[PDB]
Structures are given as structure tokens and as C-alpha cells.
Design a protein around this ligand. Structure first.
Ligand SMILES: CC(C)=CCC/C(C)=C/CC/C(C)=C/CO
Lengths: 270, 104
């Protein structure tokens, strides 16, 4: 499940920014250097089984980005592109393959079997954009082979080389805190869970063996070390905060759940 | 169209005075991508803050993780300051930590 994202911001006809990066499953593996004009390898297993093929992959991406920026600048007025605008592209694969492009953060065009098809909502301006993108059919055949053929060879060199990374088990740590206290006479009990990997996790406030269905599970947030973070909050009346506990289940614990108790200075005791 | 950023602040480890930690500010769901995010210590901007590479979600909204290594003390107060074209004024989201029971 490797995919590449592409961010191009056109501030005016003579100023821009370009950000490119590659992703294995959810782990960033590559980054493009605009100045160096070369692929940087975030990890040692990012090179795959390819040795040196990388020079062609660089100059191929270098050419196709040179054509893209100049083509967008040339046809901007014809496509009703008004500065400042941003174009986002994501292309990848998995049994599956995709290549989608957005204009101003909305679905604009997508690459189906062998050509660029407009999203019917994007109107005539997307149809005109597909006319420019479908000018050269050999270029679209190259794009077809990159998604259907070149990518599966990329996953072969990446997934096997870095399988120990995606399948590693990192145990979480957890702690309790008071929340911003919604509503008079009530408390917000917060259960933090950080440092776990992989992403699937189970966390609930408990009264003994009874799961507390008021548990509000937040978003799973990234940590710069590659692990994940999550807050689970429970709102209770000040009196009925007794015998409450947070229970964390994770694949790394092998059934040894983390159990923390709303106790001590949290209550606070006497 | 334009989308206002969601701002979420968290530490890597539980707050313990004198122990090094990592303060995080995850900014997501915004559009366009131009944004300024600062980590604050006692209202003062923290220098040399790292952030991840700009990325976007399935709905094309962008997201960024800002983080820095820090050591909290008892008096310190940390927060995240974000400004964006969707905001009338810079929005400040605090790092919520407990300081134990109040009365001794
Ligand atoms: C990485 C491989 C082999 C396929 C992913 C598809 C890809 C290279 C997308 C590039 C995104 C893009 C807009 C490039 C500049 O035209």
C-alpha cells in the first residue's frame, strides 16, 4: 500500500512551492528535495532492491514536474486557474491503483485505466484540463505502467526490506488527568495513552467490569518517534467519580491490560 | 474551499517537573496550506521547534505535527498558537496538565 503525495502551491506566475513525499502504509519513506532535485531516502530500506534505477526515477520525476509547472503556468488562464491556487495529487497502489488530482482542495480529475477523466462536478474546466493532460497518449501509457507495473516492484523492494518496522510492537504507557471540566458540578476524567504501535488500540473508562459508555475516544494523533497518542475522556458528576478506572488493551501487551485508577490526589483522598 | 484548522496539544509522557518530555501540537483539517504555528512557553515563542513534512488527508485537508523537546517546571505554562486565513485572530490552545491536588 505505497502512495505518493504531491503539493504544489502557485502563489503567482513567478512564485511557487513544491512538496513531494512517498509513504509505505502510513510511514513516510521518501522526500523530494526541490533544490538538490534528488530523492532523499528517509530510512536505509527506502532504497529497496533498486541500486543507483534511482537515477532514472529521479530524472523521470524531474522531467514530469518541470512539464507540470510550466504547463500549469501556460494554461492557467485557459483553465480559469486564478492565483493563488493549490494543486494536490496523490497516486498509489496496493490489487488496486489510484491517481487523483485536486484543485483548491476539491476533486478535479482522476487517472482511470489509460487516460485522465474529469470529475463531473468539476465542470467544463476539468474537461479542458483533461484535454491538456491527454495530449500525449504515450505519456499516459507511461503513467499507466507506473501504477500497474512499476509500483508492485516498488512494494516488493520496500515491504520485504522493512517488514520488521511495520510489524514491530511497542508497548503503550498511560496516565490520568483532569479535563477542562464541562458543566457545573461535573468533572472530566482524561485517560492518556501514548507510545503505542501499531495503531489499533482499545481504551475505555471502567467501573469494575462495566465499560462506561460515556467514554469519548479522541483522534489517534501521531508522535514524531513513530508511535501514536490518544485521549479518552469521561464526564461524570463530582460525587459519582468513585471506583472509576481506565483500561487499555493493545496487541503489544499480550492480554496484560494497563489499568489505572482514579485515585490518590486525583480524587483527592484525605 | 477554506477550512479552519483543528488544533490539538499533547505531551509524549506524563508531566513530571524536571523530566525531559516532548510537547506536540497537531494541526489538521485546514485549507489552504499556508499557516503559521508557534509553541509558547509562558507566552514567549519557543525557538527551534521541529515540524513534520506537510501532508494531507483523503478529503485533501492538510495536517502538520509541530513538536519540541522540553522540561516542565511548576510555574511553566505551555500552549500552541496558530494563525490562518480562516482565523480572525491567532487561536491559542493550552497544554492541559494537572499539578496535583491544590490544597496541601
Ligand atoms: C512511486 C510510484 C512508482 C508510483 C506512484 C505514483 C506517482 C509517482 C505519483 C507522482 C505524483 C506527481 C503529481 C508527480 C508529478 O507529476
Amino acid at each position: 500500500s505505497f502512495h505518493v503525495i504531491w503539493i504544489a502551491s502557485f502563489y503567482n506566475h513567478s512564485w511557487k512551492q513544491n512538496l513531494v513525499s512517498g509513504w509505505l502504509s502510513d510511514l513516510q519513506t521518501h522526500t523530494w528535495d526541490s533544490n538538490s532535485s534528488t530523492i532523499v531516502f528517509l530510512w536505509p530500506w527506502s532504497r529497496g532492491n533498486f541500486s543507483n534505477e534511482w537515477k532514472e526515477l529521479e530524472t523521470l520525476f524531474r522531467i514530469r514536474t518541470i512539464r507540470s509547472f510550466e504547463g500549469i503556468r501556460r494554461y492557467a488562464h485557459e483553465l480559469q486557474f486564478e492565483y493563488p491556487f493549490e494543486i494536490q495529487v496523490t497516486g498509489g497502489c496496493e490489487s488496486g491503483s489510484f491517481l487523483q488530482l485536486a484543485y483548491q482542495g476539491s476533486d478535479f480529475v482522476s487517472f482511470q485505466n489509460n487516460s485522465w477523466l474529469p470529475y463531473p462536478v468539476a465542470g467544463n474546466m476539468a474537461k479542458h484540463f483533461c484535454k491538456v493532460l491527454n495530449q500525449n497518449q504515450h505519456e499516459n501509457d507511461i503513467t499507466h505502467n507506473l501504477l500497474s507495473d512499476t509500483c508492485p516492484r516498488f512494494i516488493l523492494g520496500l515491504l520485504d526490506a522493512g517488514k520488521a518496522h511495520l510489524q514491530r510492537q511497542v508497548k503503550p504507557e498511560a496516565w490520568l488527568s483532569h479535563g477542562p471540566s464541562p458543566g457545573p458540578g461535573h468533572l472530566q476524567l482524561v485517560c492518556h495513552v501514548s507510545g503505542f504501535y501499531p495503531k489499533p488500540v482499545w481504551v475505555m473508562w471502567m467501573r469494575g467490569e462495566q465499560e462506561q459508555q460515556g467514554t469519548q475516544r479522541g483522534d489517534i494523533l501521531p508522535s514524531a518517534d513513530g508511535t501514536w497518542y490518544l485521549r479518552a475522556t469521561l464526564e461524570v458528576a463530582a460525587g459519582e467519580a468513585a471506583d472509576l478506572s481506565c483500561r487499555v488493551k493493545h496487541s503489544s501487551l499480550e492480554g496484560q491490560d494497563i489499568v489505572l485508577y482514579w485515585e490518590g490526589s486525583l480524587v483527592p483522598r484525605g | 474551499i477554506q477550512r479552519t484548522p483543528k488544533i490539538q496539544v499533547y505531551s509524549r509522557h506524563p508531566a513530571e517537573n524536571g523530566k525531559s518530555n516532548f510537547l506536540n501540537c497537531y494541526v489538521s483539517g485546514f485549507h489552504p496550506s499556508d499557516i503559521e504555528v508557534d509553541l509558547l512557553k509562558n507566552g514567549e515563542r519557543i525557538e527551534k521547534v521541529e515540524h513534520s513534512d506537510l501532508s494531507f488527508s483523503k478529503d485533501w485537508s492538510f495536517y502538520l505535527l509541530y513538536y519540541t523537546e522540553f522540561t516542565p517546571t511548576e510555574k511553566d505554562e505551555y500552549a500552541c498558537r496558530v494563525n490562518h486565513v480562516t482565523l480572525s485572530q491567532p487561536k491559542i490552545v493550552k497544554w492541559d496538565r494537572d499539578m496535583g491536588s491544590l490544597v496541601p
